[PDB]
Amino acid sequence: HLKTANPFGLMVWCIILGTPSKGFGLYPKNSSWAFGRLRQNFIYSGTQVPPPADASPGGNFYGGGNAEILNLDEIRKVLQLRYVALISNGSIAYINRMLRY
Amino acid sequence: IGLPTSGAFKLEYRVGPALNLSPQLINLMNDRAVGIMPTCAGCDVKVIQE
Amino acid sequence: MITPELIPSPFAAQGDKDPIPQTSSTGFANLRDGYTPDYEISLASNNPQAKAVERKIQNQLFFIATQNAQAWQRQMAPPWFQGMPGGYEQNAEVVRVGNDGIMRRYRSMVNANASDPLSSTTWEEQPAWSAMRSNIPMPAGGPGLSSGGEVITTGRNFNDL
Amino acid sequence: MITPELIPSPFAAQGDKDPIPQTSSTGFANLRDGYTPDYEISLASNNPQAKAVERKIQNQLFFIATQNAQAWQRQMAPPWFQGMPGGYEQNAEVVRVGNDGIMRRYRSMVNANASDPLSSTTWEEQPAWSAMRSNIPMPAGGPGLSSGGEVITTGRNFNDL
Amino acid sequence: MITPELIPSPFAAQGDKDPIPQTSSTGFANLRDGYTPDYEISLASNNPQAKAVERKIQNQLFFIATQNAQAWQRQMAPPWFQGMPGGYEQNAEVVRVGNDGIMRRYRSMVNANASDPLSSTTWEEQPAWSAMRSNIPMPAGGPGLSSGGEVITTGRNFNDL
Amino acid sequence: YVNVTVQQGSSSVAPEAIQNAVVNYAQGKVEGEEGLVVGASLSAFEVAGAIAREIPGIYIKLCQVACVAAGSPAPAPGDFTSEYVMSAFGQATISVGNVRVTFV
Amino acid sequence: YVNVTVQQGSSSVAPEAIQNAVVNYAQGKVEGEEGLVVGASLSAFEVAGAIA
Secondary structure (H helix, E strand, O other), X not given: OOOOOOHHHHHHHHHHHOOOHHHOOOOOOOOXXXXXXXXXXXXXXXXXXXXXXXXXOOOEOOOOOOOOOOOHHHHHHHHHHHHHXXXXXXXXXXXXXXXXX | XXXXXXXXXXXXXXXXXXXXXXXXXHHHHOOOOOOOOOOOOOOEEEOOOO | OOOOOOOOOOOOOOXXXXXXXXXXXXXXXXXXXXXXXXXXXXXXXXXXXXXXOXXXXXXXXXXXXXXXXXXXXXXXXXXXOOOOOOOOOXXXXXXXXXXXXXXXXXXXXXXXXXXXXXXXXXXEEOOOXXXXXXXXXXXXXXXXXXXXXXXXXXXXXXXXX | OOOOOOOOOOOOOOOOOOOOOOOOOOOOOEOOXXXXXXXXXXXXXXXXXXXXXXXXXXXXXXXXXXXXHHHHHHHOOOEOOOOOOOOEOOOEEEEEOOOOOOXXXXXXXXXXXXXXXXXXXXXXXXXXXXXXXXXXOOOOXXXXXXXXXXXXXXXXXXXXX | OOOOOXXXXXXXXXXXXXXXXXXXXXXXXXXXXXXXXXXXXXXXXXXXXXXXXOHHHHHHHHHHHHHHHHXXXXXXXXXXXXXXXXXXXXXXXXXXXXXXXXXXXXXXXXXXXXXXXXXXXXXXXXXXXXHHHHHOOOOOOOOOOOOOOOOOXXXXXXXXX | OEEEEXXXXXOOOOHHHHHHHHHHXXXXXXXXXXXXXXXXXXXXXXXXXXXXXXXXXXXXXXXXXXXXXXXXXXXOOOOOEXXXXXXXXXXXXXXXHXXXXXXX | OXXXXXXXHHHOOOOOOHHHHHHHXXXXXXXXXXXXXOOXXXXXXXXXXXXX
């Protein structure tokens, strides 16, 4: 779990701990157009199918904010915290030490 | 922070200036339905706090 | 005041804009749902229902708002529209331009009336203040918009009346 | 002539919508700042403020635009928004729902008028020229709505008038 | 009768914004082409005019739409903009800042009305309905604003006539 | 057109999973259920059965079905019934966009 | 209580295997869909789904 970079493992752990996975940000990134040259662009009817694949191979609204985290490292932290919550008896020194860990 | 957070059976977290945790992260941890936070029944705990 | 500086022309109004359907069975950008949840799937999912954000729809969406805004800026009343769903409610006004070309503001004197305002008695023409001030045959203070001058200030010839 | 095509239903009418936060400490599509600069960094860099454009935020924006435009297109005028910041300034003719059921235009006369149109003296109606002219005993043109017809060069019948 | 939501502030009111031109040079936003199709092209593929969606342009577009809707909600009439290109057709109705900032309805009498309504004799200023009830030398039904009461069922005693 | 009023359970689900389940049942890709063959009646109870087929745990509150002509405006609310019977020379097609999921 | 109306389709006769399915689902036997619990809500669509 400490090295569940593989999102599939993060999801297996969402099932194991019982976390609702609606709010997670798995799948590869680079699919949001938004704004900026570092993100995706819109798409059109490139009927000729030119090699640049028009402006982008896609561009979507995936990654809706205010509830969903995108970086997988914080997903790992969240799942560890949920295991701590599952086995927690309410102790404060214990919870502080696991937050440290 | 004065620290006491006066009250009974209820407290809160405090985090964020250190780890650059995402606001999306904090909002997710602040949702009681998800139930990822270590909680005792009969304590309202809000994470929020930066 | 809040001044919505006049936009010279609507957005993308010489280029391309695919019309917005009311509903989309293929899960595209319709009006009943706006941007469907299918516009939230990761495109890297290899899910066929993952719809990338097209801009023909985006251009049409922006063009609708820009054109409505500039019509509001440049012609005041909303143009009357053929067969508005539900006709037009009581006291609702529109402007149906006539063969003259001048704007002809029309008020709905009949509830839920769908009659053509250009050829409607129900769609009453809203005349100008000059028309009202001339429709009063005995106006105080001559033809002035103000009613002032009710009492004459000094000794003045009745030839002015 | 600018006639932006009829808006039958606003974008994202019955779809999901996120009410835009007025002000956000962490930059989250707020009205005060708009799309804040943190909506532009690459998501792969894993920096904390790597936001993405929310589908429901976009839906709510287009819904607001299309809803206001359609209301203007249909009822000629914005409704009376109760809890209006700063009341209603002088010369403000809000369309008001009738207690009976007729839409009735009440104009605030005093600057920053803040009372309900139905229960305030400040709000004054702007009716149609028919009930308006009903206050004139002796309308120009007699039965005729227009100013004309009052003067007849020909010896018209004295009985019919 | 659809009631939009109270717009307290336009989107991106205090955010960075860029003016949208009418003519284009590269894969840049316009007002007649909008988002360009030809240079729409892959932005991360080392191509010459390869363009990215512009935060400033889209923020200002939302700002414009929300500003128009907000001003519509408050003042119900576009402010007459100083020397707006294209002119005004006659009978157009606007309201704009007056001599004191006190504003009233103005209706133009000439097409291509390039003169400011505060400085235009063609633009005629239209006050409220109390001004009609004053312009009639005697108000129907006495001080009573409504025409009802002009005819009296019981003989109106002359101790107060 | 199918209107569903699902209630989210413990495990997370997306409305598109429900839509895909309904579409797969309609096409008949599921075992046992024939689907919407020629002269197959459109029952909201069978559609709810397919949703429970593919997505256990989700608590379905209200399922309604409606049938309209091809290339016609979507039916207004109230036209939806608990079950629609069909003639012997008709076939109902349910796309992903005609399944409207409400998370109550 | 439950009343069901079926058609005995596919020419596969099964008269009284329906209430067994209903009670089996209600008792919590089925997988993934916990049956009638202290917080449940008896639903026609759920029981029809269990029969299916």
